[PDB]
Design a protein around this nucleic acid. Sequence first.
RNA 1: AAUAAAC
Lengths: 117, 1177, 376
Amino acid sequence: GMQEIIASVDHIKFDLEIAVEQQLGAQPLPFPGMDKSGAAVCEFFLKAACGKGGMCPFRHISGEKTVVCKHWLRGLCKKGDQCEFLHEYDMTKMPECYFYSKFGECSNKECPFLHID
Amino acid sequence: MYAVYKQAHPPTGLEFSMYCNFFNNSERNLVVAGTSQLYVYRLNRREKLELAASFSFFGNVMSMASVQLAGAKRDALLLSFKDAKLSVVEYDPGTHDLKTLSLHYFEEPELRDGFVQNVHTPRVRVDPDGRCAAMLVYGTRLVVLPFRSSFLPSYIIDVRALDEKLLNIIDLQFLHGYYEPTLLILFEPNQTWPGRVAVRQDTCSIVAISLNITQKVHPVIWSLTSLPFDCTQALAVPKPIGGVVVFAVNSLLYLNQSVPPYGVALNSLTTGTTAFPLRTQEGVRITLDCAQATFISYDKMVISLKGGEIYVLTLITDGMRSVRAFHFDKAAASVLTTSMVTMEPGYLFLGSRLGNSLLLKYTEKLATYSFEVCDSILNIGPCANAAVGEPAFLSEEFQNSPEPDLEIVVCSGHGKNGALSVLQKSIRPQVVTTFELPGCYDMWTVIAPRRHGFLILSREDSTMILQTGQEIMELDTSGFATQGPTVFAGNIGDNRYIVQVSPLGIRLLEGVNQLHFIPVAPIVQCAVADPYVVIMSAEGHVTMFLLKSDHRLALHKPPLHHQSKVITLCLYRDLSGMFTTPTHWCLLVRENGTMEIYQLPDWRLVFLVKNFPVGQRVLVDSPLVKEVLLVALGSRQSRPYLLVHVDQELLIYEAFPHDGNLKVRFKKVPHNINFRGRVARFRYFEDIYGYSGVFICGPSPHWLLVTGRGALRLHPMAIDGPVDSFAPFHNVNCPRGFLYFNRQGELRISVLPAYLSYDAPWPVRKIPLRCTAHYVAYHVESKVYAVATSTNTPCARIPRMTGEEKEFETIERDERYIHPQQEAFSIQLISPVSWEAIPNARIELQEWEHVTCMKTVSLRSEETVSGLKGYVAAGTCLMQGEEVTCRGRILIMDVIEVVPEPGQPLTKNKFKVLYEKEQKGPVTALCHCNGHLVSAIGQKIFLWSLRASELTGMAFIDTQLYIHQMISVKNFILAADVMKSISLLRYQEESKTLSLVSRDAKPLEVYSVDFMVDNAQLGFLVSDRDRNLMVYMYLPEAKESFGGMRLLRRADFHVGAHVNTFWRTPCRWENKHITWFATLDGGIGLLLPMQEKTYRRLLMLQNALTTMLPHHAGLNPRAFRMLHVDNAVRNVLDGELLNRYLYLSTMERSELAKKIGTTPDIILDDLLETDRVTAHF
Amino acid sequence: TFDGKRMRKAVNRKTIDYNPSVIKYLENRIWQRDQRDMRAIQPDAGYYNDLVPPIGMLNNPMNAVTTKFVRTSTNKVKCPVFVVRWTPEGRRLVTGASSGEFTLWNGLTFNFETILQAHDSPVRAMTWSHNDMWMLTADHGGYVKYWQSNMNNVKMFQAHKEAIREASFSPTDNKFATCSDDGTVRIWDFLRCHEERILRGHGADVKCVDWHPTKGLVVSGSKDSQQPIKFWDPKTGQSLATLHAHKNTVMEVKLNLNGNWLLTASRDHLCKLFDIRNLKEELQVFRGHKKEATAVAWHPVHEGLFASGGSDGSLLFWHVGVEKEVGGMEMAHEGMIWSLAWHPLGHILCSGSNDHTSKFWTRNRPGDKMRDRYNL
RNA sequence: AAUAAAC
Ligand SMILES: [Zn+2]
Ligand SMILES: [Zn+2]
Ligand SMILES: [Zn+2]
């Protein structure tokens, strides 16, 4: 039962899995100011320089960013990769709630942003 | 890319049914039809339906009716297929196939009136008096078929160009009386929606158009125009009363052209929705919205409602042959039907897709009827989710076989008929006692004073005898001759006298003691049949014996003129037989290539086929055959089956009656089996676990079973290798059972496992739940099944949203008011040891909550030696109408062994819920990716990491509308949307990032997705709300796609039925998998990936098999398997058409090989390797 | 000023949540086989769970005659809107006003999401890609901008010297067509922004253009009587055919996804169908707008049914095969309607007024008394 | 931070 015991495919190296490693013919994206939020992170920039920074179809991350932005959580980020804010889901580096700092309490109980004292 | 579709289960679940003269004008026949398969049933009288013919079609039957033409001896059928194909077919005598009388292609671009998307189904109707026949093509066109060189050319009547402007047709019938064939039509000139009834109150109308066949004109008589807004089917009231009863959802009308409209209501939902003048039927609150009905006699009507309840409406008739009022009574409840037929007086067939379609019996009570249940046809219903699992009690002798040992569990049926189905393909015997007896190769069990007394083994030098009883133990004394081998040992008389034959002498025995002896050219086989013994040597000499009392066997050598050498023999008698002109028959195959049946007391020639060893389809009177066996199988040994062994190829024949010779001919039946002193291979057994039939010995064993159903059942037996010999065996510690030799010389006392039911095409145990089985999930640890179910309770509240809390509103209506159905879900826990549901283990959900998915999720852990833990995870959300925000809840469960409750060994297992938290929106699908639960909340697909106690999120993307299916392998998630697409994902794990790779840019209504696996090619198998299959691939170096964004379909195939389930298992083809699926019409199919070189030798075969063979109902097997047309990159072979290459005779097999350019032995090595590798389950 | 920093008390907005209807559709789907097996919804307020979306009840297309009011989504600056289109995943409604602002309305609870300032002009045309990638927006100045799905401004240029009125593009994402008030239908390349050819000879300002979904046609309306409808050809530039249909000023020209029908709305109180395979004859006409018929939106799943806008603020639903209309809001939507857009599930509808408002219409509930100010 | 809170 449960295919992973029967149809065990971990010994198979698919052409799908090879073609995404060395990226197999990604056309460079036109119209230079684009974002493509939702693109696979490139391992060429992790090891080496991938060259075409800013006009590469994959994303480039740096280890500088600290807190998540309010804007990626809705899918609206004009800044793109060169934002100062982290774009990961991690629900521990959120901004503090504005409605605690000025206006006492918050109104909705399902407020995502960080509630501190 | 290159694959083949193969079908491992014929689809069950009937849809259409009638009662017509299929074979002959004398008796009648239940003719049921399903998705692309026709069945014809007789009726043995306790009563039981008996199968008599089964037919397969390259097209799904959309309607079915029967008319009896002028001068014909039978009753023709009018089969309606998809995109307006009518096909008049008849039964044929002579050959036992179907003769097709007419096709009528009606698919035209100028008939569809510009509408591309066809929604309406074609509907055949015929006259009560059989004057014409009508077909409503496309919902706006009538095709009139005139009847009396027996047909007349049709003519299309445009419906919307007539009077009254029909537009929407609901149902249409022909009426009774009426010298011209009057066609009644329900329609709606101004169509409305239930839910918008304040601006359109009620609009349904009736035109009874009167058809002139000769003049080809048609005037409207008897219009009505203000029937209620929701009218379902109309029913022609029969001849002495006339008229029509028009079912509505909430009311019931009787209509006639001279009588004023009489109509009553049923429940009080006709308050503000219908201004038609309606009465109130008393003591009744029911609804007629999916109701199937028929007329029993006249002025009575059995109405199978939804909910399976059966009412009997009597039309209360005055003296004027008019209707005063209606009378209802609540009779017995039954299956949720999809059809309804009165057979003979007192019998009702209830054809149902979902549920076992059964036969009823009704008698009057001392007007009022009571229904009794005679027989039911087994049905694997609409297979919703089906999970592969492992059996429990495979014996320790078979325990170290290298292949996996597994059997699928299917959520079949719906509702009250909801069930689980434990399907299996081969038979795994229970071995109770084994031995190791070398040297001896043949075996026999005879009955001595009805348990079996003696086990007789022939060695190459001597003979072993065994005594049975308390302990089976080897026998030492005289009687049998152990000084040499024994050719054959068997009973003579009736279990009182035993005969063995040695290659020199012939021995009676009245028990252990020898009665007398007759000596005799090596004797190679014997025919002990009834009271006669025919003994044949090696050079072709034939002698015959006979019991004569004084008991003493008498030599009577047959008077035969040997034109050539007799090769093999058989004997056979007719307990309930058809061999007309208990009577004994001798079958005799000579070496010239002929077959001769002999009447046995005399020796005159009765039946003669001049070219026998080819393998022809139908034989009629006037190489190197090994073995030939005639046996009867079924109730009272009714129908006989020929079984031969010709050049490593099994081919078995039926028998059917057909008018100084035998009045029979032999029709060939299909197979899935290859065979690649004298030893018998065809070993007839009577009463093993009640089942009678043949065991077939060889390199692949096959149990041949025919029960009283009359349906042929071939069951393989793949465990424990090829089998040399076999014998039935009935003992004390072994019940009715069997006894065979392994190839390694191991005798095995065995009994069939008693929990299955071998009457069905696969051996299946049908587990009734009496609630709708939605999902099923094998848990490997602690070895149980987790099933989400649902029962229907009456709804009583209505949720609202007032900005601060939810406010329920109580439904408060009259006491004459049917209630809406609320569904309460609960998660069962099923034990494979005994299939009882485990008590005190049932998770029950909230008041409005619905399981949308259940899978078995492998989350990573720090406990075991691997990472994974095999949890059961269910996503579930609350349906409280559209005005309330739908939110959901992820539920992670793990089965935990505890100490058992005393007296209940099944209660050692119980759920423990690790996680139950309400999410931020609906939860729609779930997955596991290297130990990460992947969930789809709304328009976002999250990816959770389970900590010691809680789920913490890692990544997501914004997806399309409603992701309802996800499966994944090795950080690649494939998603599936309701309307849009599939959207394959990818997950780097070093950074917590989920991303989109590619997507189908078209709109497409996916049922469920899969992963086709080849050596390096990973296909993306997807099913279409259009009964299709298609395989997308991610090809970045291709240029007809765009650079890594668009998926491309590479294989297209039109399966006839919807698909929800997908199983992958490796073939017994270096690294390829078989991605199985179970079609929603109840069948089970395959997809086997092939190489290109093997593919195009068979594509050249299929293009020749399509053209040069007379298919059933005149259909085209190519256009049926074209994509969606019932742009197209077809690359999947029709393995149900390539299987008609095996059915061809070997004279005709060699003509298609020479017309495509190969030898026939290569194609048989091409095809039969696709059946060897696919022998799972 | 609304900067999003002033607090407010929580409220549960009216919702027209499509999720409990799809789940009911996926559960019926298994044991249904057609519509002929379907258990009928009965007109009472207790049968609310049994609604299926318009994929479910595929015939009976009178389903999505959306005559139940939901919500007027208005701005604070009150500008008259021209084009309103749904994001193709149904997540949000962008709205093109007269001040060039893109007010993104939420898709279930229709509150507000964000406002932009796209153009320096009234937005006149707005199309999404055939995938989720791009969004073309033209304005009254003549500029054509591309828009990503995160509403980032991407490459801009000028297509016309005068006000563009409608855009559409090929059955792939390569080649669009902008018609303007100078009378030229200029056909553009996508990736290069290259004016491939100009479709001259219209003879009047042209105010609508649609592309054929397979065959590669461009069908243009006009403000000129002598050449009211000109078929075109995107590869040759040759005028393929001329259709003399209406008396004056075809406002919209639309096409099914099937590709066998040409639907045309004009200022002479008429809508007309045309089979594009047979231009000499004529399919049915659509009388029922008492004033000018200025907007048309075909239905996405129910082929053959379309809503329709009036210049008097009227809203009407039509169906191909029926002489009268299926049912509409005469005089009930205030103002002049400019454009209509169905949700990708064809269950809710949006309208854009010459008023400063936009109203969302959904299907009627079972068993309700339609006694409201819009129906009765 | 770029309108998170715009009945
Ligand atoms: Zn890069
Ligand atoms: Zn950002
Ligand atoms: Zn807060």
